[PDB]
Amino acid sequence: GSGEPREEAGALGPAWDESQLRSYSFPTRPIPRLSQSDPRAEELIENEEPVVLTDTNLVYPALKWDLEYLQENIGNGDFSVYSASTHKFLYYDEKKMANFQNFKPRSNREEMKFHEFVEKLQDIQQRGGEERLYLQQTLNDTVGRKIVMDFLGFNWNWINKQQGKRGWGQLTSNLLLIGMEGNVTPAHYDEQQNFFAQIKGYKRCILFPPDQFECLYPYPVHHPCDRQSQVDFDNPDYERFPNFQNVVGYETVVGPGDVLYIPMYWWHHIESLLNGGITITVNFWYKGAPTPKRIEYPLKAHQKVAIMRNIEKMLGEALGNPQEVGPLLNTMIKGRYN
Amino acid sequence: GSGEPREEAGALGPAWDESQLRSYSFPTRPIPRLSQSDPRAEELIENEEPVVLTDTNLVYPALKWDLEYLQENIGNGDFSVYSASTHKFLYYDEKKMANFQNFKPRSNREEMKFHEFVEKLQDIQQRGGEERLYLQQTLNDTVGRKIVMDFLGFNWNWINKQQGKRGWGQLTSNLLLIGMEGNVTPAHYDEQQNFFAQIKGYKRCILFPPDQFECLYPYPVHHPCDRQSQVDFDNPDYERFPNFQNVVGYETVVGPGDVLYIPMYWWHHIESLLNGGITITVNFWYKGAPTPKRIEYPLKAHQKVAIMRNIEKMLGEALGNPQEVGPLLNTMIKGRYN
Ligand SMILES: O=C(O)Cc1cs/c(=N\C(=O)[C@@H]2CCN(S(=O)(=O)c3ccccc3)C2)n1O
Ligand SMILES: O=C(O)Cc1cs/c(=N\C(=O)[C@@H]2CCN(S(=O)(=O)c3ccccc3)C2)n1O
Ligand SMILES: [Zn+2]
Ligand SMILES: [Zn+2]
């Protein structure tokens, strides 16, 4: 999967061991770890394939970040902090909750100050509780001068050259992620290009190419969990999701200084290693390049994914009610295309 | 189904008996036979429900038509004549035959003069052959003066008032249908409003409302047999088409002078009665009224049918190949909406 664990400099031991990885039913192949100066890494990014770049220095000034330094300097703004009773955080589109009245939400959001999230995490650790927290906040203007200086110290030269070379849209946001050990963001896909810059701790990243759509069974587009896989990776229901027995992933473990390119529409399952301490990540999201004027066949897998999304959307509007999308689609194919 | 057979005037016996009707697996209810002056008949047509009008005099001058009079006066143009080895005529869109290379056609068209079709039918009857023929030709300018006079004698006053009252488009064509006894046009639906004017002989008409789409399993839109039911009414495959066990039809027998309104998108199965002689029919097709500017919910069944047709069409163009429509639709719903 992730290969034999890397050895940290200065003979400080292995960065992790296989007992910090969760157990799943599918095989994986390693994502390549390359230098940013390696043309193989440019070839991968251009072909919209994942790659771990080891030496971008993208967030070099942020490698000194921890909770004390952040609490001291990140400012007095509000931070979105997500809770969870188990290791799996259950995200959902709150705007789409109206369409599914029989939807029980289980990972609630709560805005708080940074110093509150820090002492709330210290609250849990000593009381021995099993509640998990996950801070996920877009970096804004309300951060202190020191964080602004660190932010200005990012390798904007390298990443801006990446944005122009690939024809991507401009940077949409930076997401700061601080998570507890063992936290799991379940498999889902995003519609923007992602540079996943690891800062503190180690995160296991399992990626699935867009052509695995058939094996990962995303929720209906109108469901609050749109773009998330319905499959419970810890207890896969092979009767509902038989092609999950065919899924093959791409796996890597990113540590401080690593930058993982997650191509747009690629599924990713992200977990903070067991017993590995808190994790810190900053993401760089770019809107993908505009679709070519004339079409090249055969279509890319992510184009077919977008086609399916648009059919579901347009059908929900045409029928007036997203709940009728399913029965019409079954009416369309039953005994005609299946 | 069609009720007890009507008694012809002058004590000339029953117009038909139940032994001239084919045997099928589904129940039926009678289509109402009404006077054109009956408001119930106007209510049915306005609600796009079938009705048999008994006294339109729509094609009154044509009631004297037979093969001798037609051969004498219909002119020297070409007439499309369809052949068939069995009673079921297998029509298909020749333009869509490219998409389905593994399609074997079994009811071939052949253009000929009217006098040839007449003596070819006399050829078959005396040689005892089992080959069937079905003349289906749009009436054009190349018809003799006498047929023009008969055509001018149609009740244009009544039918034009119908066209304006319902907001329909203008008349698209008149189809002259001359068929042999026992001929069957299998179940299919049309996208225009139809006034089905019976002239000679009797035809059993079995209609299914558009909301029976699920029970009648039409071919893929890109298939040459688009808009036709895949179900063999003489040997229904309940394993492929389980909801055909739920279908209920509307049934009637039309004779000379009867006009059957077949509403747009209504399925119809039309058969010339066994041992009943040749049949003559003229159809009047009108494009339906333009769809209302703002939408009224819930949708009509035929609107959902049109929605499904457009998804299949647009998907075939987007993917570049109609053969990929099926697998993408299954990919879309398998384990997500089913
Ligand atoms: O725990 C982890 O490390 C894994 C993890 C935490 S958050 C996350 N992803 C996201 O938060 C967004 C939500 C929607 N998309 S988006 O449409 O591309 C977009 C991008 C920019 C602005 C708005 C929308 C990705 N991942 O994968
Ligand atoms: O044997 C019988 O009596 C039954 C029978 C014989 S032919 C027939 N139907 C048709 O020939 C057309 C083919 C396509 N449509 S259409 O889109 O509405 C249309 C209408 C006008 C111009 C062009 C297209 C109906 N039926 O039902
Ligand atoms: Zn994501
Ligand atoms: Zn028809």
Q: Are A142 and A77 in contact (CB under 8 A)?
A: yes
Q: Considering only CA atoms, which of B189, B262, B180 is closest in space to residue B229? A: B189
Q: B306 labelled as ligand-binding? A: no
Cβ atoms of B154 and B57 within 8 Å: the answer is no
Q: How far is CA A259 from CA A45, A126, A184, B160, in A?
A: 12, 33, 19, 74
Asked if B184 and B22 touch (Cβ cutoff 8 Å), the reply is: yes
Q: Give the A window 261-280 contacts with B, CB below 8 Å.
A: none
Q: B336–A218: do the CB atoms touch at under 8 Å?
A: yes
Asked if A129 is an interface residue toward chain B (Cβ–Cβ < 8 A), one would say no
Which ligand does the CA of A184 lie closest to? 1
> Token digits for B334?
């398998």
Binary contact (B307, A295; C-beta < 8 A) = no
Three-state DSSP class for residue A256:
coil
Q: Residue A220: how many CB atoms within 10 A of its CB?
A: 23
Across the beta sheet with A259-262, the strand order is: A33-34, A51-53, A259-262, A192-200, A279-287, A171-179, A132-138, A79-84, A109-112
Burial of B65 (0-12, 13-18, 19+ CB in 10 A): buried
Nearest to B329 among A240, A326, A332 (CB): A332
Check whether B198 is labelled as a binding-site residue. Answer: no
**CA-nearest residue, atom 5 of ligand 1:** A185
For domain A4-292, give the fold: Jelly Rolls (2.60.120)
3 state DSSP class of A238: coil
Rounded to whole angstroms, what are the CA distances from B16 to B19, B31, B268? 8, 17, 21
Ligand 2 atom showing the smallest separation from residue B279 Cα = 3
Pull the structure tokens for residue A65. 């970040």
Q: HSE on the CB side for B128, CA within 13 Å?
A: 0
Pairing of strands B249-254, B28-30: parallel
Can you read off the two tokens belonging to residue B210? 């558009």
d(CA B7, CA B12): 7
Phi then psi for A316, rounded to 5 degrees? -65, -40
What residue ranges do the domains of chain B occupy? 4-292, 296-338
- Resolution for this PDB entry, in angstroms: 2.0
Near ion ligand 4, which residues have CB within 5 Å? B 190
- Atom 6 of ligand 1, residue of closest alpha carbon: A185
| Interface contact A326-B338, CB threshold 8 A | yes
Pocket-forming residues, ligand 2, beta carbon under 6 Å: B 136, 172-173, 175, 177, 185, 190-192, 268, 270, 281, 285
Cα pseudo-dihedral A157, A158, A159, A165, rounded to 10? 100
Which residues of A are known binding-site members? Answer: 134, 141, 170-172, 185, 188, 190-192, 194, 203, 227-228, 268, 283, 289, 310
Q: What angle do CA B217, B222, B223 make, to 5 degrees?
A: 60
Find the A100 Cα to ligand 4 centroid distance in Å: 42
Please confirm whether the linkage preceding A242 is cis (ω < 30° from 0).
no
Q: State in Å: Cα B336 to ligand 4 middle.
A: 36
CB-CB under 8 Å, A299 with B336 = no
Query: What SS3 class is residue A297?
Result: coil
Parallel, antiparallel, or unpaired: how do β-strands A267-272 and B33-34 relate?
unpaired
How many residues would you count in chain B?
338
**E strands along chain A, which residues?**
28-30, 33-34, 51-53, 79-84, 109-112, 132-138, 171-179, 184-189, 192-200, 203-208, 249-254, 259-262, 267-272, 279-287
Neighbouring CB atoms inside 10 A of B37's CB total 9
Q: Are A62 and A199 in contact (CB under 8 A)?
A: yes
- Which residues have a beta carbon within 5 Å of ligand 3, which is an ion? A 190
For residues B219 and B226, the answer to whether their CB atoms sit within 8 Å is yes
- Position B77, amino acid: G
Q: Any CB–CB contact under 8 A between B219 and chain A?
A: yes
Taking the C-alpha atoms of residue A180 and residue A85, their distance in angstroms, rounded to an integer, is 13
The reply to whether CATH 1.10.287.1010 applies to domain B296-338 is yes
The first and second tokens of residue A268, run together, are 């990713």
Residues with C-beta less than 6 Å from any ligand 1 atom: A 136, 172-173, 175, 177, 185, 190-192, 268, 270, 281, 285
List Cα–Cα distances, A54 to A29, A60, A200, A258, in angstroms. 18, 12, 14, 5
β-strand B33-34 against B51-53: which pairing, if any?
Answer: parallel
Q: Which residue of B has its CA nearest to A311?
A: B311
CA A119 to chain CA mean position, Å: 26
User: Hey, CA dihedral for A321, A325, A327, A332, is it positive or negative?
Assistant: positive
Closest by CA position to B6, among listed B180, B307, B257, B284: B257
Task: Tell me whether strands B259-262 and B171-179 are parallel, antiparallel or unpaired.
Answer: unpaired
Q: In what order do the strands lie in the sheet with A249-254?
A: A28-30, A249-254, A203-208, A267-272, A184-189
Method for structure elucidation: X-ray
B54 known ligand binder = no
| Ligand 1 atom, smallest distance to A183 CA | 1
Q: Give yes or no for a contact between A53 and A35, defined as CB atoms under 8 angstroms apart.
A: yes
3-state SS track over chain B: CCCCCCECHHHCCECCCHHHCCCCCCCEEECCEECCCCHHHHHHHHCCCCEEECCCCCCHHHHHCCHHHHHHHCCCCCEEEEEECCCECCCCCHHHHHHCCCCCCCCCEEEECHHHHHHHHHHHHHHCCCCEEEEEEECCCCCCHHHHHHHHCCCHHHHHHHHHHCCCCCEEEEEEEEECCCCEEEEEECCEEEEEEEEECCEEEEEECHHHHHHHCECCCCCCCCCEECCCCCCCCCCCCHHHHHCCEEEEEECCCCEEEECCCCEEEEEECCCCCCEEEEEEEEECCCCCCCCCCCCCHHHHHHHHHHHHHHHHHHHCCHHHHHHHHHHHHCCCCC
Alpha-helical runs (H) found in A169-288: 213-216
The burial class, CB within 10 Å (0-12 / 13-18 / 19+), for B279 is buried
Strands of the sheet containing B132-138, edge to edge, are B33-34, B51-53, B259-262, B192-200, B279-287, B171-179, B132-138, B79-84, B109-112
Strand A249-254 versus strand B33-34 pairing type: unpaired
Cα angle B68, B74, B80 (rounded to 5 degrees) comes to 100
Strands B259-262 and B203-208, by their bridges, are unpaired
CA distances for B180 relative to B24, B87, B114, B260, angstroms: 20, 9, 15, 20
A226 touches chain B (CB under 8 A): no
Chain B residues closer than 8 Å to A319 by CB? 299, 304, 307
3-state helix, strand, coil in chain A (%, to 5): 30, 25, 45
Between the CA of residue A156 and those of A140, A149, A151, A153, what are the distances in Å? 17, 13, 10, 8
